Write a protein that binds this DNA or RNA. Structure first.
Lengths: 96, 206, 127, 150, 79, 113, 98
RNA sequence: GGUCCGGCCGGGAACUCAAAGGAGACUGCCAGUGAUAAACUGGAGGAAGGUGGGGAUGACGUCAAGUCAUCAUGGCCCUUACGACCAGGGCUACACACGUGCUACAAUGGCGCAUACAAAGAGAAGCGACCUCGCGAGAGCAAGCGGACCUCAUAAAGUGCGUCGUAGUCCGGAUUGGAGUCUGCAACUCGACUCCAUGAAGUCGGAAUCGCUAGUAAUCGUGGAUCAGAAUGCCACGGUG
RNA sequence: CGAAGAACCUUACCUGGUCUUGACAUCCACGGAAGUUUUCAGAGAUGAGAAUGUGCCUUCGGGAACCGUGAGACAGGUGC
C-alpha cells in the first residue's frame, strides 16, 4: 500500500479513539447486548465509517493489508529484510 | 536470488542480534515498530560519522544508543553536548529515555560496513567504478583480513546496462558455520540509479 | 526397590518397573485388552519377548503414557529388552538379533514448503 | 542405484503364524487399516478350514502355491527382442503377484462382505478355476507360445 | 441468506417517513439507503433505492420488506 | 395406512421407511417414533396397531406433501413478481448462494456441453 | 510461592543471564530453587520469500523462547540482590514479581 | 504412605517428560578383496554405521524470467488533476473453457450406542470451563488463566456391539425453501455456521497424464497464523500405516 | 500465485456527491490553549452554527504542541 493509502488508515485509527475510548463502552455495551429498536440504530450508527470493525490495521512501517502479522507488528518483506541484518531478536532459519 | 545472501543465520549462531530486547507476545509489535522507526532517524543523524553499525538494547524502561564508528572524532563532537541532543530525538519516537554508549576502533579496513559507505561516497562523486571497490579491498588486505570479497552492482561509467563489480582476493567461504563473516549493505543514490553495495570480510575463523 | 528398562517408541515413552516374579500381565492397573483399543498389534508384541521368555521370570507392570496405540505396544518392546539385559547379557544379544533393543529408526517426518502432506509434492498437468 | 535393495522386516500372523499369511494382510491393506483387515483373515480361514483338508495354513499356502506364476514378462532391447520375454521370478515375488490378483477378484464380487467374497475365491484356488488363476494362463500362454529368448 | 434478528430500519428512511406522514407519493424517493426494511406507513410508495449507478423506483409491497430493499434492484445486468 | 402420498415402503426399518414420506426425513422419522413411544428395531413391515394412528397424526403436524410443495412454489413466484434477486435468478436458473458460475454451477446451468 | 520469569530467545544468553543472579540466590532461603527450565513457548513463522508470485518457496524462520524460573522460594531479607540489583538485561524478561 | 482412589495430599527425585551441558561414529576396529592406494563387501560392539534421519545449506552462471504494486529509485508524463475524500457498486459476473484442491460413488462400509489411545501450537478489544437455558449451532451466568498451571480439548479414524443388506440405496450430499445463530451500524450483489425439510449428480471414470522408494505413500483427524467475522487454501503436529 | 480469510471500508476500478499548497510533508506568517458535547441540512462526504474548556513558558510580541486560514517553493501519483 502506497504512502497515501497508509495515511488514510492512520487518520482512521486516530478517529477510532473519538468513536472508541469513552465512546467505546458507549458504542458497544450501553447500546447492544439487549437494552433496542429505532432508537439503538441511529445512535450506534454515529458516523458509520469509524469503529474497530472498520480498522483495516496494516503495518505501521510500510502498510499493505496482505501479508500481515498483527501479533508481532511485522509483515511479508519486513521479516526477511529486517531479520537478516538482525533487526528482530530471536529469529533464525527454521529447524524446529 | 543467488544464495540466500546469508548473514542472519550467522547472527543466529554466533553474536547476538543487532536489536536485542524483550517483550510479551502481543506487546512485541509496539516495541518492534518504535525501534525500526528510531533506528532510521538515528542512522540519518548518525551519517556524520562512518557507521560501523548502530545496535540497540532495550530493557523496556530505557533504550541504549550504542553506535560504534570509525569517526568517533565526530560522535563526541565537543564533549557530551553532541550526543545529548541526539538522545532527545530517541526519546520522541521510542518514548523512554536513552543513554550514550562507547564507540571503539579497529580500523575502517576491518568490519564490512566501513568499507561500504566509503566506496559509495566515491561513486556518488562519480569516480573510480572498477578501481573504486578495488582500492578499498587492497586497503582491507593491507592490514588484517583473511580475505575480503566485495560485490557491488554494475553500471560502470554510470552506464545503463549493468555488468557487476566483483573483485575478491584471499578467501571468503560463504557456507562456513564456524564463520567470522561480517556483512553490511549500502546503496548509492547516483544520478542514474541505485548501486547496491555488498562487503563480505572473513576476518577470522570464529 | 525395583529394576527399570526404558521404552522410547515413536512418540510414546514408557516407565517400566519390574517386580521379579511371574503371574501378572498388567499394564496401567489394566491389562492388554483393557488398556489397548483392541488393536491387532498388541497380541503380536507378546511373541518377540517369549524368545528369552517372560511371565516366568518377571512380572509385567508398565506405566506408559503419551503417543500412539500401536506406538505404545511398541514401547513395551523397548522397555522389556531393556529390562532383560539387567540380569544377564545373554538376554540382550538375542534382543538385538530380535531388533527390539534398537530404538525405532523411523520417526514422523516434517512437512516442508510446497508439500501438501509429509512428502507429497502436488500433482500437476501443465506439460 | 548404488548397492542393491535391503529387506524389510514384516511380522507373521500372531494366532497361527505364517509370514506368508501376514503378507496377505499387506496385500489387503487399503486405507492403511490393519485393524479392520485382521477380521477378514480369520473370516475366510474358517470357510476354508471346514471345506478343505490339509492344515489351516495349507488351506491358503499350498492352494495358492499352484496358481502363482513362475514367469513374469517385461521387455528390453538386449537379446535382440522387441518382445515380451519370460522371467523366472524369485519365489517370494511368485506369491505377491497371485495374492494381488486374488484380491482384485473379490472386489469384482458383490457376494456381500470382503469376508465371503475373497473366501469362496480362495476355496476355488485348490479347485483351479476363478479369474484369479486365469491370469497365469495368459502370461505363460503368451511366453511359451511366442517364446523369444529367455 | 440472513438478516439475523437485527434488520437495519435505517435512518435515511427515518427522515423520509417524517416527510411522508403528511404526504403520500409526491416524488420517487431519492434514497441511497439499501439496507432498509420499511414500516408499513412507507409501504405503498415508490422508494427509489440507489443501485450503485442511478436510482430505480420500486413499487414496494409487503414481501419486499421481508428482506432488504437493495435486493429488488439489480446491481449488474447480464445478457 | 399408506396415508398421504401413495406407498409406504417395507422390508426395512421403521425409521428408514418413514424417511420416505415426502417431507419426512432422517431426524423427523425417529422423532415420530419417539412420540408414538415405539421402536425402530421392528420394521414398518410389522405396522403396529398403535403406530397406525400416529402415522397420520404426526405427519399432520408437519408441513408435508402437497401443502408444503404448494407454499414453497407459491413463493418462487412471490419474489419473482417484486423484482427480487432470488426472483429473476430462478428464471435464468442461477443460484442465490454466491456460488462459482465462472467455473461450476452445473446443477443450475445443467452439465458441461 | 515466587515466580520470577526469565524468558529469552536463545539459550546461549538466557544462561549467561541465569548465571549473573543465581550466585547470591545460594545463600538465599533454605528451599530456594535452581532454574526450572519449562517447555518452550515457541514461535516460528513462514513468510513469503519474494515480492511477487509463487508460494512453494517461503522463507522459514524459528524462534524458541524457553522459560527458566530460578526462584528464591521461601523469602529472606537477602532477596533484594537477585531481584533488582544484579539483573536488568535487555533480552530477558526481567521479572520483579513475587 | 494418605486416600473423599483423582498426581487430588504430603512425600519422594527414581522414571518419563521437558531442555541446557555432555557421551558418541571417525570407514575407528575384525576378516576377505584391492596396488600391502583409497576404497569396496561382509562382521562386531553399540541407539545408530560407511552422505545415520530430517532441516537450514540454492556454486560460478542462464532465462533483457518475474516483481516501479512492500519499499527504494533514473527518466518521462499528470498538477481548480490518471491527484484527493466519501457513499454505493464492481473484486465472489456469465452463455462457456482450462488448472490446483475437496467429497462421494460404498459394506476393506455407512449410520446408532458406548468405548480406546495423542502430538504440537494459541491466548487480557482473548480463549472462554462451570451452572442455567437452548433439539442445535450456541446464548445467558461467569470461574480461571496473559498461561508445562487455566481455557481452546472432547483427538478422530480405530474397537467391542446394534443395525442396514449391494438397492442409487439405510449410500451420497449438491440444490433450494423455510427456520435460526454469530461478528458487526448494517451480511443486497459478495459472509460463514447450525436446524429441519428438500433431497442432486454419481453405481469408480475414454484418449492421456502426474504423484509417491518409508514413518513415505495412503487415509484419519488435531493445532496455528491472516482472522471483528468466512478455510475443502496455506502452514504445522501426531494416529494408524 | 501475489493475497497470511476481499461483506462496508478493503480498493487500486467504476458511477455519483465533493475538494484544490491540498488527504498525506517540511518550511514562513497570522488568528485561536488544545479541546468538549450537541443542533440543523445532506445519502454521507461535509458545511455552517449553538453552548462549554482556557494548558505549557514568555521578554508579553513571540513561541512549544495543536487546529483552521493565507501565501507560495512545493506536496501527491498503486501514473508509464
Amino acid at each position: 500500500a502506497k504512502q497515501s493509502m497508509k495515511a488514510r488508515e492512520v487518520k482512521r485509527v486516530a478517529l477510532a479513539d473519538k468513536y472508541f475510548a469513552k465512546r467505546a463502552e458507549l458504542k458497544a455495551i450501553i447500546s447492544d447486548v439487549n437494552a433496542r429498536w429505532n432508537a439503538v440504530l441511529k445512535l450506534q450508527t454515529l458516523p458509520r465509517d469509524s469503529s474497530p470493525s472498520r480498522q483495516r490495521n496494516r503495518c505501521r512501517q510500510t502498510g499493505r493489508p496482505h501479508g500481515f502479522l498483527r501479533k508481532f507488528g511485522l509483515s511479508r518483506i519486513k521479516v526477511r529484510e529486517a531479520a537478516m541484518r538482525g533487526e528482530i531478536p530471536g529469529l533464525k532459519k527454521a529447524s524446529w | 536470488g543467488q544464495k540466500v545472501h546469508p548473514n542472519g543465520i550467522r547472527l543466529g549462531i554466533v553474536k547476538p542480534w543487532n536489536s536485542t530486547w524483550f517483550a510479551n507476545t502481543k506487546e512485541f509489535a509496539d516495541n518492534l515498530d518504535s525501534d525500526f522507526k528510531v533506528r532510521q532517524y538515528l542512522t540519518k543523524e548518525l551519517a556524520k560519522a562512518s557507521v560501523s553499525r548502530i545496535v540497540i538494547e532495550r530493557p523496556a524502561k530505557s533504550i541504549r544508543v550504542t553506535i560504534h564508528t570509525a569517526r568517533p572524532g565526530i560522535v563526541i563532537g565537543k564533549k557530551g553536548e553532541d550526543v545529548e541532543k541526539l538522545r532527545k530525538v530517541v526519546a520522541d519516537i521510542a518514548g523512554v529515555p536513552a543513554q550514550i554508549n562507547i564507540a571503539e576502533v579497529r580500523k575502517p579496513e576491518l568490519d564490512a560496513k566501513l568499507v561500504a559507505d566509503s566506496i559509495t561516497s566515491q561513486l556518488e562523486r562519480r569516480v573510480m567504478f572498477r578501481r573504486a571497490m578495488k582500492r578499498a579491498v587492497q586497503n582491507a588486505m593491507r592490514l588484517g583480513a583473511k580475505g575480503i570479497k566485495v560485490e557491488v552492482s554494475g553500471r560502470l561509467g554510470g552506464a545503463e546496462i549493468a555488468r557487476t563489480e566483483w573483485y575478491r582476493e584471499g578467501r571468503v567461504p560463504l557456507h562456513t558455520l564456524r564463520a567470522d563473516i561480517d556483512y553490511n549493505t549500502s546503496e548509492a543514490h547516483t544520478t542514474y540509479g541505485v548501486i547496491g553495495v555488498k562487503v563480505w570480510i572473513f576476518k577470522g575463523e570464529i | 526397590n525395583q529394576y527399570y528398562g526404558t521404552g522410547r517408541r515413536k512418540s510414546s515413552a514408557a516407565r517400566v518397573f519390574i517386580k521379579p516374579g511371574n503371574g501378572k500381565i498388567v499394564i496401567n492397573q489394566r491389562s492388554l485388552e483393557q488398556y489397548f483399543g483392541r488393536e491387532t498389534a498388541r497380541m503380536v508384541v507378546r511373541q518377540p519377548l517369549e524368545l528369552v521368555d517372560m511371565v516366568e521370570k518377571l512380572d509385567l507392570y508398565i506405566t506408559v503414557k503419551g503417543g500412539g496405540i500401536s506406538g505404545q505396544a511398541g514401547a513395551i518392546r523397548h522397555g522389556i529388552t531393556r529390562a532383560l539385559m539387567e540380569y544377564d547379557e545373554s538376554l540382550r544379544s538375542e534382543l538385538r538379533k530380535a531388533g527390539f533393543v534398537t530404538r525405532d529408526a523411523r520417526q514422523v517426518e516434517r512437512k516442508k514448503v510446497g508439500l501438501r502432506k509429509a512428502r507429497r509434492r502436488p500433482q500437476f498437468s501443465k506439460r | 542405484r548404488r548397492r542393491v535393495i535391503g529387506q524389510r522386516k514384516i511380522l507373521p500372523d500372531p494366532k497361527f503364524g505364517s509370514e506368508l499369511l501376514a503378507k496377505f494382510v499387506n496385500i489387503l491393506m487399503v486405507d492403511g487399516k490393519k485393524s479392520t483387515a485382521e477380521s477378514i483373515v480369520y473370516s475366510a480361514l474358517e470357510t476354508l478350514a471346514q471345506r478343505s483338508g490339509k492344515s489351516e495354513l495349507e488351506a491358503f499356502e499350498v492352494a495358492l502355491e499352484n496358481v502363482r506364476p513362475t514367469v513374469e514378462v517385461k521387455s528390453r532391447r538386449v537379446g535382440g527382442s522387441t518382445y515380451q520375454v519370460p522371467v523366472e521370478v524369485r519365489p517370494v515375488r511368485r506369491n505377491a503377484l497371485a495374492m494381488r490378483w486374488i484380491v482384485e477378484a473379490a472386489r469384482k464380487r458383490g457376494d456381500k462382505s470382503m469376508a465371503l467374497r475373497l473366501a469362496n475365491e480362495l476355496s476355488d484356488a485348490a479347485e483351479n478355476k476363478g479369474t484369479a488363476v486365469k491370469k497365469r494362463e495368459d502370461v505363460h500362454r503368451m511366453a511359451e507360445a511366442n517364446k523369444a529368448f529367455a | 441468506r440472513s438478516l439475523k434478528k437485527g434488520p437495519f430500519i435505517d435512518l435515511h428512511l427515518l427522515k423520509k417517513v417524517e416527510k411522508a406522514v403528511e404526504s403520500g407519493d409526491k416524488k420517487p424517493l431519492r434514497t441511497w439507503s439499501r439496507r432498509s426494511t420499511i414500516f408499513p406507513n412507507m409501504i405503498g410508495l415508490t422508494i427509489a433505492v440507489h443501485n450503485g449507478r442511478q436510482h430505480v423506483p420500486v413499487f414496494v409491497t409487503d414481501e419486499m420488506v421481508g428482506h432488504k430493499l437493495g435486493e429488488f434492484a439489480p446491481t449488474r445486468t447480464y445478457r | 395406512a399408506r396415508i398421504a402420498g401413495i406407498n409406504i415402503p417395507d422390508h426395512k426399518h421403521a425409521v428408514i421407511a418413514l424417511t420416505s414420506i415426502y417431507g419426512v426425513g432422517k431426524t423427523r422419522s425417529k422423532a415420530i417414533l419417539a412420540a408414538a413411544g415405539i421402536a425402530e428395531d421392528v420394521k414398518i413391515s410389522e405396522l403396529s396397531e398403535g403406530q397406525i394412528d400416529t402415522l397420520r397424526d404426526e405427519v399432520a403436524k408437519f408441513v408435508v406433501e402437497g401443502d408444503l410443495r404448494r407454499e414453497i412454489s407459491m413463493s418462487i413466484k412471490r419474489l419473482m413478481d417484486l423484482g427480487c434477486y432470488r426472483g429473476l435468478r430462478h428464471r435464468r436458473g442461477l443460484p442465490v448462494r454466491g456460488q462459482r458460475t465462472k467455473t461450476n454451477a452445473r446443477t443450475r446451468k445443467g452439465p458441461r456441453k | 510461592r515466587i515466580r520470577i520469569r526469565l524468558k529469552a530467545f536463545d539459550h546461549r544468553l538466557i544462561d549467561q543471564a541465569t548465571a549473573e543472579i543465581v550466585e547470591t540466590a545460594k545463600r538465599t532461603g533454605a528451599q530456594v530453587r535452581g532454574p526450572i527450565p519449562l517447555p518452550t513457548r515457541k514461535e516460528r513463522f513462514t513468510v513469503l520469500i519474494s515480492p511477487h508470485v509463487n508460494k512453494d518457496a517461503r522463507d522459514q524462520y524459528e524462534i524458541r523462547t524457553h522459560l527458566r524460573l530460578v526462584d528464591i522460594v521461601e523469602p529472606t531479607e537477602k532477596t533484594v540482590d537477585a531481584l533488582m540489583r544484579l539483573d536488568l538485561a535487555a533480552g530477558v524478561d526481567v521479572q520483579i514479581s513475587l
